[PDB]
Design a protein around this ligand. Structure first.
Ligand SMILES: *[C@@H]1O[C@H](CO)[C@@H](O[C@@H]2O[C@H](CO)[C@@H](O[C@@H]3O[C@H](CO[C@H]4O[C@H](CO)[C@@H](O)[C@H](O[C@H]5O[C@H](CO)[C@@H](O)[C@H](O)[C@@H]5O)[C@@H]4O)[C@@H](O)[C@H](O[C@H]4O[C@H](CO)[C@@H](O)[C@H](O)[C@@H]4O)[C@@H]3O)[C@H](O)[C@H]2NC(C)=O)[C@H](O)[C@H]1NC(C)=O
Ligand SMILES: CCCCCCCC/C=C\CCCCCCCC(=O)O[C@@H](COC(=O)CCCCCCCCCCCCCCC)COP(=O)([O-])OCC[N+](C)(C)C
Ligand SMILES: CCCCCCCC/C=C\CCCCCCCC(=O)O[C@@H](COC(=O)CCCCCCCCCCCCCCC)COP(=O)([O-])OCC[N+](C)(C)C
Ligand SMILES: CCCCCCCC/C=C\CCCCCCCC(=O)O[C@@H](COC(=O)CCCCCCCCCCCCCCC)COP(=O)([O-])OCC[N+](C)(C)C
Ligand SMILES: *[C@@H]1O[C@H](CO)[C@@H](O[C@@H]2O[C@H](CO)[C@@H](O[C@@H]3O[C@H](CO[C@H]4O[C@H](CO)[C@@H](O)[C@H](O)[C@@H]4O)[C@@H](O)[C@H](O)[C@@H]3O)[C@H](O)[C@H]2NC(C)=O)[C@H](O)[C@H]1NC(C)=O
Lengths: 182, 48, 78, 181, 99, 74
């Protein structure tokens, strides 16, 4: 049961937004709880090397599941802070993660007084306007990457919950159906 | 090295207290091995 | 080393721009006090780093030399 | 990233997990001194590496959060970490009496905006230097860890008992090779 | 720090699982009362973490996903329009926060 | 704690007034936010001393009741 609960917790990080500043805390703490529960398991389960116990297979599956969650979360977080100053959006990322998938979802693609001081003020107002125009352009470019990260988070939330269910069944269902079919 | 960490990173307490937590884990490690008498304190416990 | 070396229509426009200038001046003064406090924080942090290094080295050296120089006796019966 | 990714927490948590694994191992072997266990060797190597990575993360965060008001961005340092290493790794006074406050204020706003732009640009430059150092440390540390892990585990993977029970004796001491008189 | 607090509470509960693991009898006719209660507390913490994630997701939903005088007036209009856009963005963020 | 009165010019004037009013509202909100921050600061300053005093007092209350007895018996 605790392994099942940790497996359920593994996929929860993909619904947590990156702007919370808590994705890595959640994932790493799930891993730490699993590591501490390894003490319980080494205490409670026989130390035999004749075969891998079914429950041991479930343990290793859950451990790999959490580690994969951490790796994929690092990828998502790296994607979410991609900026125009450092990265250029590839065309295939725009083709897939903006239009091909999100279209399925429900969101948004996302007199002459010439004087050294007066002329300076005129040029400065123009400069400020151009500055915030450029800032708006860069903000939109960053929001594109943020939307991409959000779409990956949704897809991989679905994938991780599905694989949690499937891997719970694939380890246990055989012997349980054998027992029920007695 | 926590003192070389900037305050603006917001990761001083985490590092320091998790170092303390690791120290507590090593105290748990040592609890099974040390003598239980009270005539003196082992130097390794003094170091811990 | 600290880097720092230490008509009715237009009247509303003039007063508004004066307000923005005053607000930004106040923001600059608040910023200056903030960097003063932050610089003292950094200086205290460096001082604490150095004394922590000293305490660590001294205590570790004393404990390690106490452990290292504990040899068995050469004579079984002193 | 150095702004949303809590690096030192992850690294010190890896250290904590390594400590828990040492706690698991410590109960299962005698405390002899003939040799260090192979898993013990790997755990010591990994803990030293994680300590070095935490130090690296502290230094990278020190590099990232530098500001003009605290540090001076040296031109040799900037050129090394932004150009070389990124490539290697990969009347008309009554009117003036009322418009002078406006013109003075507007020039003040423009100067404030320019100063903020320069400040933010220098912050971005420090962030780029931190990212370059991080990528260098990625290309340095990870191959070392892979090589050390492979070296440690290939001793035990290739550790087998000798084909004969006694070195110097060619006899196999098996039933099929029984020695008649 | 909602998620930090909840998940660290769960970590402490796992330490408690290790503490009781060395004391509970190992038969299988019935589940002990302490084991039932610890499982219940675990599940409650899991639900708290789920709700924390959901609430943070809801609260952090940005609204984007649910002569020279004639040049000066254009620049000023652009500045004011950008500031108005920023104010509307802030209002939407506040609405999601209250929800 | 003398005027053009073209729609673009009037819009620019209204825009400058809007910047000023928005900054005024932001300052007014920040003032009350700082008031709440000051209240929280004051409770923090009080409760640091309270908790240090409790840390000393509870330890002494737990242990001195037997340590003073052990001092009296000898
Ligand atoms: C598992 O564990 C067992 C032990 O529990 C291991 O068995 C041991 O294997 C080694 C190597 O095969 C044996 O060493 C050899 O011993 C023979 C016989 O000499 C012994 O008996 C003599 C009387 O019959 C006696 O005189 C010998 O004493 C003399 O020699 C020793 C050793 O040099 C010396 O210390 C004394 O002072 C004496 O001078 C001795 O007790 C011996 O002939 C072998 O000689 C080989 O090695 C020498 C160099 O050291 C070399 O010069 C020779 O040419 C030759 O190659 C060798 O010493 C040992 O006796 C076994 N122990 C036993 C039987 O209990 C086993 O190998 C392990 N298996 C593994 C790890 O796979
Ligand atoms: C991981 C594999 C670890 C290597 C150990 C191994 O040999 O596999 C083991 C873990 O069997 C598994 O494959 C683990 C159970 C599921 C994996 C968990 C993550 C998915 C089982 O051994 P095997 O070889 O898979 O099959 C046993 C037969 N033989 C040991 C006699 C050959
Ligand atoms: C493993 C340790 C590796 C240390 C060397 C690598 C990092 C060096 C480093 O950045 O030093 C750091 C920590 O400096 C220290 O803390 C030095 C002492 C470390 C060991 C103490 C043993 C007792 C910084 O040391 P510094 O003196 O502050 O260096 C100037 C930094 N500055 C330009 C930001 C002001
Ligand atoms: C997935 C991995 C295996 C699942 C299925 C195992 C097969 C099986 O026998 O099912 C068993 C799973 O027993 C249960 O009833 C569930 C566990 C007990 C409830 C949780 C305990 C604390 C609840 C606090 C929160 C059903 O067998 P049972 O004997 O009918 O169950 C025991 C009856 N009892 C639960 C009333 C005590
Ligand atoms: C390990 O433990 C041993 C005990 O279990 C230690 O042995 C003791 O060592 C001390 C010091 O060497 C001895 O004390 C000495 O005894 C001699 C002999 O005393 C006798 O003769 C004199 C003659 O004048 C007489 O006066 C006495 O009454 C005795 O009859 C003295 O001359 C020395 O001054 C000194 O007192 C202990 O006797 C001895 N104990 C035993 C039981 O052997 C040993 O030192 C320890 N090893 C270490 C610590 O490395």
């Amino acid at each position: 049961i605790p392994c099942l609960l940790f497996s359920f917790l593994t996929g929860l990080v993909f619904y947590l937004p990156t702007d919370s500043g808590e994705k890595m805390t959640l994932s790493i703490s799930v891993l730490l709880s699993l590591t501490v529960f390894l003490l319980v398991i080494v205490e409670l389960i026989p130390s035999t090397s004749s075969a891998v116990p079914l429950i041991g297979k479930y343990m290793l599956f859950t451990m790999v599941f959490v580690i994969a969650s951490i790796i994929i979360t690092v990828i998502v977080i790296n994607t979410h802070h991609r900026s125009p100053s450092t990265h250029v959006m590839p065309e295939w990322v725009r083709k897939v993660f903006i239009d091909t998938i999100p279209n399925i979802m429900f969101f948004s693609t996302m007199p002459l007084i010439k004087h050294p001081e007066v002329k300076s003020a005129i040029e400065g107002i123009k400069y400020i306007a151009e500055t915030m125009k450029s800032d708006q352009e860069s903000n939109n470019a960053a929001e594109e990457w943020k939307y991409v990260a959000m779409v990956m988070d949704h897809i991989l939330l679905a994938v991780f919950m599905l694989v949690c269910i499937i891997g719970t069944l694939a380890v246990f269902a055989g012997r349980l159906i054998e027992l029920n079919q007695q | 090295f926590v003192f070389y960490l900037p305050p603006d990173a917001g990761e001083k307490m985490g590092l320091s207290i998790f170092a303390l937590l690791t120290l507590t884990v090593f105290l748990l490690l040592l609890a099974d091995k040390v003598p239980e008498t009270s005539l003196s304190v082992p130097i390794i416990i003094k170091y811990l | 080393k600290r880097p720092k070396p230490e008509p009715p229509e237009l009247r509303e426009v003039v007063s508004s721009i004066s307000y923005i200038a005053r607000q930004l001046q106040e923001q600059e003064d608040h910023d200056v006090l903030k960097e003063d406090w932050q610089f003292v924080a950094m200086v205290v942090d460096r001082l604490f780093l150095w004394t922590f290094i000293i305490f660590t080295s001294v205590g570790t050296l004393v404990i390690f030399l106490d452990a290292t120089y504990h040899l068995p006796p050469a004579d079984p019966f002193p | 990233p150095a702004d949303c990714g809590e690096k030192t927490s992850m690294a010190i948590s890896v250290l904590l997990a390594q400590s828990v694994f040492l706690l698991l191992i410590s109960k299962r072997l005698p405390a002899t001194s003939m040799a260090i266990p192979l898993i013990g060797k790997f755990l010591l190597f990994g803990m030293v590496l994680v300590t070095m990575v935490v130090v690296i993360c502290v230094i990278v965060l020190n590099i990232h959060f530098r500001t003009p008001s605290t540090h001076v961005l040296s031109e040799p340092v900037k050129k090394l970490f932004l150009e070389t290493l990124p490539e290697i790794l990969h009347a008309q006074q009554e009117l003036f009496s009322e418009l002078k406050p406006a013109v003075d204020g507007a020039n003040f706003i423009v100067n404030h905006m320019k100063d903020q732009n320069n400040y933010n640009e220098e912050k971005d430059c420090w962030n780029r230097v931190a990212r370059t150092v991080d990528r260098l440390c990625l290309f340095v540390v990870t191959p070392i860890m892979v090589v050390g892990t492979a070296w440690i585990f290939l001793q035990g993977a290739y550790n087998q008992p000798p084909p004969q029970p006694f070195p110097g004796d060619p006899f196999s001491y098996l039933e099929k090779d029984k020695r008649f008189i | 720090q909602k998620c930090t607090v909840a998940i660290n509470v769960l970590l402490a509960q796992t330490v408690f699982l290790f503490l009781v693991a060395k004391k509970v009898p190992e038969t299988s006719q019935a589940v002990p009362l302490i084991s039932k209660y610890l499982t219940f507390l675990l599940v409650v913490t899991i639900l708290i973490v789920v709700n924390a994630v959901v609430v943070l997701n809801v609260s952090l939903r940005s609204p984007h996903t649910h002569p020279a005088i004639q040049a000066c007036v254009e620049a000023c209009n652009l500045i004011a329009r950008a500031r108005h856009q920023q104010t509307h963005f802030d209002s939407g963020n506040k609405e999601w926060f209250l929800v | 704690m003398p005027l053009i009165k073209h729609p673009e010019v009037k819009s620019a004037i209204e825009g400058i007034k809007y910047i000023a009013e928005t900054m005024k509202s932001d300052q007014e909100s920040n003032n009350a936010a700082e008031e709440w921050k000051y209240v929280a600061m004051v409770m923090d300053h009080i409760l640091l001393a309270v908790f240090m005093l409790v840390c000393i007092i509870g330890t002494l209350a737990v242990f001195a009741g037997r340590l003073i007895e052990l001092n009296q018996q000898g």
